[PDB]
C-alpha cells in the first residue's frame, strides 16, 4: 500500500481542489 503511493507520479494526478464551504447571509431584523 505505502510503496504504491510512492511509485506513482503525483505531478500527473489531478490538481488538488479546494473544498471550502460558501455561505449566503440573509439580512432582516425588527425595528428598535
Amino acid at each position: 500500500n505505502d510503496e504504491r503511493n510512492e511509485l506513482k507520479i503525483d505531478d500527473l494526478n489531478e490538481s488538488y481542489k479546494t473544498n471550502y464551504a460558501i455561505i449566503h447571509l440573509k439580512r432582516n431584523a425588527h425595528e428598535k
Binding site: 504504491r4 511509485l7 503525483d10 505531478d11 500527473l12 489531478e14 490538481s15
Partner: protein, 752 residues
C-alpha cells in the same frame, strides 16, 4: 486518459500526459509496426516506464498477433518498480474496460530472493541456497522416499504442494509483484520461484534482469520457453556492455587450483568406492555415452546440470563424446593433469597475454590434451557427478570453475584473451598469481538476442552518444533519437566547478589523492553545500578506494565534525545488507527533516537502480570524473580490441565510459517535473565534456556555468533553490509542459 494513435487505442493511467511521453509513444509504435531495433533516450524527469507499459500493453491487447512483451532491467530492485507500475496501469484498465482481461505478468529472480523455506532462506550465499533447493527438488529424495519411507531425507512442502494443482492454476489471473507474490504463496505454502519459472510460457509480459538473457549459464533454460516474436525492451541499458562482458569472463587464483586438486582426489576416491559396491551405474552411463546421448537427453527436466553451460547454446558441439573422457577413470585423469598444467602456468614472473589458440597449442605440447575433449569438459562432468550419488557436493564445488574454464577456452578463439599476472595486488608482500580469462568483444554475448528476436527497443535515461552503441554492439537501428524535456521553468541547475574558493584547480586524479590542498578544497565544497542543501545530498566518488582515503583525511582534518552539525552522514559499505540499512536510515532522515548526506561510489551498487526522487535527492555532488583504473591489463586489452576492430580511439572510449557513469548518477534525482535539484560536477576535466553529456542535461548547462568556483557555485545554488520554492503559475504549464485530454487532441489535429 484514453486517447488514440493512428490505429491503436491506448489507455494512460493518469488524467494528464507530458508532450515527451506522447512523442515517445508515437515513435515506439512506429518501430513496432515497421520492425527492427531502435534506441530511444528519454529524460529521467518524465514518466518512462509507465509510458512503455501503457503503449506496449495496449499493443498486445489490440492487434490480432497478440505479441508477448519481454522487459529487461539491470537490477532486481528495478523489476519491483516495473511490476508496481504495471499493477497500477492494469488496475486503471480494469476500471475503464469494466472487466479484468486475461493477463498474466510475473517477475523473475534467483531462489535466494523467493525461497520461503524456514531453513534454506537463512543463507548468506546464493550458491548454497541453490544446492539445498536442488537436493530437495532434484527428485532423488522423492524417489528414495517412494522405495523406502524410512529414509531420513526430507522434502519441501512448497514444492510438493504444487503437484496437486495444475500449472494454469498456480496463480489467479492478473499481475503479481514480488511483494504480492510472496504473500499469496505464503498463505498457500507454495514456492514462488518454481511457480514463476513454470508459467513463463503463459505470461503476457515477463520481467527479468539482463543476466537472465545474456548470461548463457542461466539464460538458456529461461530462453527456451519464451516466444520468438515477443517484444523485447532494454530499459536502462546504458551499461549493457559490462553485463555482456562479465558473462563470458573468468578469474582463477592459486587458492582455486589448490582447492581443485582436493576435489579431484575426492572424486577419484568416490569413484573407487562406487566401483566396489555399485558398478552398474557407471556401465549404464557408459552405454548411453557410447550411443551419442548428451545431458539434455539423459537428465530429466526436473533436475539441473551440475555445471551450467558456460558457452552460448549455438556453440555447443552436437557430436558424441570423443571417447577419451568416456570412462570415469579416464576423465578424472584427464581432469587431473589439466589442473596441473594450470598450476605450473601460475609460476610466471611477468605479465603474459596470449590468445586461446596459443594457450591450446602450448597445452597440446606439454601434455596431450586435444581441443575437442576440452570442449566437452563441463558437459561430461555434469553427467559423472549426477551418476555418482554426490548428495554432498562441498568438495566438488571448486571443480565447477575448472570445467567452466576448459569449456570457454576451447570454444571461443576471437575476441577473447588470457591474462596471467604475478601480482593480483601490486602492494603485496608475497606475490599472488592470478589467471584471468577476459572477453574483449562485447557483441558476442548479445549476438543471439539480436538475431532470435526481430524487434528490440533499447531505452535509457542517459544513453548518449547513440551512435557508439551500434558501433560497439554489431546491430542496426531503424531510428535513434533523444527527446528534450519542454519544461516551462528551469527545474534542475547543472553546474561544473573547476576550482575552489581559493581559485585553485581541483581534480580527483588518483596519483594526487593525498594532497592537502585538493582534499581541503573538496571538503570545503562538501561543507558549504551541506549548509544550503535542505534535506538530502548524494555524493558520488570515482572509486571506493578514493572514498576511503579522502574520507579518512577529512576525519583527521575535522571536516566531518562540522558536517555532523547539519546532517547525518551515511556511507556506502562493501556489505550489501549494511548498505541497504544505510539507505533505509538515509530515507528516514530525509523524510523527518533531520537532513542526511549519503556518500556513495558512482560505479557502486547505489548508482545502478536506487532513485532519489524529490526529498531523498536535492543536490548531486560528483567528486571528480569516475575514470576507470587505466593501468589495468583487462581494460588495456579491451581498449586495444576496440581500436583495431571498431576503430574507436582509446581516449574517446575512456571518456565515454566515464561520462556514461557520471550521467547515470545525474538522472536519479528527477521524478516528474515538479521535482528539482542542483547537479554539480566537481572536476576541472568536466569543463570540456559538455558535448558528451545527455542532450536533456547539456541543454540545461549554461555557458557561464562551464567553469565556476566554489563561492560562485554556492551563490547560484542559493538563488536557484529560493526561486524553485515559489508557487508555480498553473497557466505557465497548462499546455506547454503538461497536456490534458483536450490539449492532446489539439496536438493530434495540428500535426495531422
Amino acid at each position: 486518459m484514453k486517447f488514440y494513435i493512428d490505429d491503436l487505442p491506448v489507455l494512460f493511467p493518469y488524467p494528464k500526459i507530458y508532450p515527451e511521453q506522447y512523442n515517445y509513444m508515437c515513435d515506439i509504435k512506429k518501430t513496432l509496426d515497421v520492425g527492427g531495433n531502435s534506441i530511444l533516450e528519454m529524460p529521467s524527469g518524465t514518466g518512462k516506464t509507465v509510458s512503455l507499459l501503457s503503449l506496449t500493453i495496449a499493443y498486445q491487447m489490440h492487434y490480432p498477433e497478440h505479441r508477448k512483451i519481454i522487459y529487461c532491467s539491470r537490477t532486481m530492485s528495478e523489476i519491483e518498480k516495473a511490476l508496481v507500475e504495471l499493477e497500477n496501469l492494469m488496475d486503471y484498465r480494469t476500471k475503464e474496460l469494466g472487466y479484468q482481461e486475461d493477463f498474466r505478468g510475473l517477475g523473475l529472480t534467483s531462489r535466494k530472493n523467493l525461497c520461503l523455506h524456514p531453513e534454506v532462506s537463512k543463507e548468506r550465499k546464493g550458491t548454497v541456497v541453490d544446492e539445498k533447493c536442488r537436493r530437495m527438488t532434484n527428485g532423488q529424495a522423492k524417489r528414495k522416499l517412494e522405495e523406502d519411507p524410512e529414509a531420513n531425507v526430507e522434502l519441501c512442502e512448497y514444492h510438493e504442494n504444487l503437484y496437486n494443482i495444475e500449472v494454469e492454476d498456480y496463480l489467479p489471473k492478473g499481475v503479481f509483484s514480488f511483494e504480492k507474490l510472496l504473500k499469496y504463496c505464503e498463505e498457500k505454502t507454495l514456492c514462488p520461484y518454481f511457480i514463476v519459472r513454470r508459467m513463463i510460457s503463459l505470461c503476457n509480459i515477463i520481467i527479468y534482469s539482463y543476466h537472465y538473457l545474456l548470461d548463457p549459464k542461466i539464460a538458456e533454460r529461461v530462453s527456451n520457453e519464451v516466444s520468438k516474436d515477443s517484444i523485447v525492451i532494454f530499459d536502462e541499458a546504458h551499461n549493457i556492455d559490462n553485463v555482456c562482458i562479465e558473462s563470458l569472463s573468468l578469474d582463477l587464483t592459486t587458492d582455486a587450483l589448490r582447492r581443485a586438486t582436493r576435489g579431484a582426489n575426492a572424486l577419484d576416491e568416490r569413484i573407487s568406492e562406487v566401483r566396489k559396491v555399485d558398478s552398474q551405474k557407471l556401465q549404464d552411463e557408459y552405454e548411453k555415452l557410447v550411443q551419442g546421448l548428451h545431458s539434455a537427453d539423459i537428465l530429466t527436466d526436473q533436475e539441473e546440470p551440475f555445471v551450467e553451460t558456460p558457452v552460448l547454446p549455438q556453440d555447443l558441439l552436437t557430436e558424441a563424446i570423443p571417447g577419451n573422457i568416456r570412462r570415469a577413470e579416464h576423465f578424472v585423469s584427464f581432469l587431473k593433469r589439466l589442473i596441473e598444467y594450470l598450476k605450473t602456468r601460475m609460476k610466471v614472473l611477468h605479465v603474459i597475454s596470449e590468445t586461446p589458440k596459443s594457450f591450446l597449442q602450448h597445452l597440446k605440447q606439454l601434455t596431450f590434451i586435444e581441443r575437442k575433449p576440452l570442449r566437452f569438459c563441463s558437459e561430461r562432468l555434469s553427467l559423472l557427478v549426477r551418476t555418482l550419488e554426490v548428495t554432498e557436493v562441498e568438495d566438488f564445488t571448486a571443480l565447477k570453475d575448472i570445467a567452466t574454464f576448459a569449456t570457454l577456452i576451447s570454444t571461443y578463439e576471437e575476441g577473447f584473451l588470457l591474462i596471467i599476472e604475478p601480482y593480483e595486488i601490486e602492494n603485496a608482500a608475497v606475490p599472488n598469481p592470478i589467471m584471468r580469462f577476459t572477453c574483449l568483444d562485447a557483441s558476442i554475448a548479445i549476438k543471439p538476442v539480436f538475431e532470435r528476436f526481430s524487434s528490440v527497443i533499447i531505452t535509457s535515461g542517459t544513453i548518449s552518444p547513440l551512435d557508439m552503441y551500434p558501433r560497439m554492439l554489431n546491430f542496426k537501428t531503424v531510428l535513434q533519437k533523444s527527446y528534450a524535456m519542454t519544461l516551462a521553468k528551469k527545474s534542475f541547475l547543472p553546474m561544473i566547478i573547476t576550482k575552489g574558493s581559493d581559485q585553485v584547480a581541483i581534480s580527483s586524479r588518483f596519483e594526487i589523492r593525498n594532497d592537502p590542498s585538493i582534499v581541503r578544497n573538496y571538503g570545503s565544497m562538501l561543507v558549504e553545500f551541506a549548509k544550503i542543501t535542505p534535506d538530502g545530498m548524494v555524493v558520488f566518488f570515482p572509486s571506493y578506494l578514493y572514498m576511503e582515503s579522502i574520507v579518512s583525511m577529512w576525519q583527521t582534518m575535522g571536516i566531518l565534525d562540522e558536517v555532523w552539525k547539519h546532517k547525518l552522514i551515511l556511507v556506502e559499505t562493501p556489505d550489501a545488507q549494511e548498505t541497504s540499512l544505510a539507505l533505509e536510515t538515509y530515507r528516514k532522515a530525509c523524510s523527518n527533516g533531520r537532513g542526511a548526506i549519503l556518500l556513495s561510489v558512482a560505479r557502486g551498487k547505489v548508482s545502478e537502480g536506487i532513485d532519489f526522487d524529490h526529498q531523498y535527492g536535492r543536490t548531486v555532488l560528483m567528486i571528480g570524473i569516475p575514470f576507470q583504473y587505466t593501468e589495468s591489463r583487462i581494460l588495456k586489452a579491451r581498449l586495444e580490441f576496440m581500436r583495431e576492430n571498431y576503430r574507436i580511439r582509446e581516449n574517446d572510449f575512456l571518456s565515454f565510459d566515464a561520462m556514461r557513469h557520471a550521467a547515470q548518477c545525474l538522472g536519479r534525482v528527477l521524478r516528474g517535473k515538479d521535482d528539482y535539484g542542483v547537479m554539480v560536477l566537481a572536476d576541472r576535466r568536466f569543463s570540456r565534456k559538455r558535448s558528451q553529456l545527455p542532450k536533456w542535461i547539456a541543454q540545461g548547462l549554461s555557458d557561464a556555468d562551464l567553469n565556476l568556483s566554489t563561492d560562485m557555485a554556492i551563490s547560484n545554488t542559493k538563488q536557484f533553490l529560493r526561486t524553485m520554492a515559489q508557487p508555480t503559475d498553473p497557466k505557465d504549464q497548462e499546455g506547454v509542459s503538461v497536456w490534458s485530454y483536450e490539449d492532446l487532441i489539439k496536438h493530434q489535429n495540428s500535426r495531422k
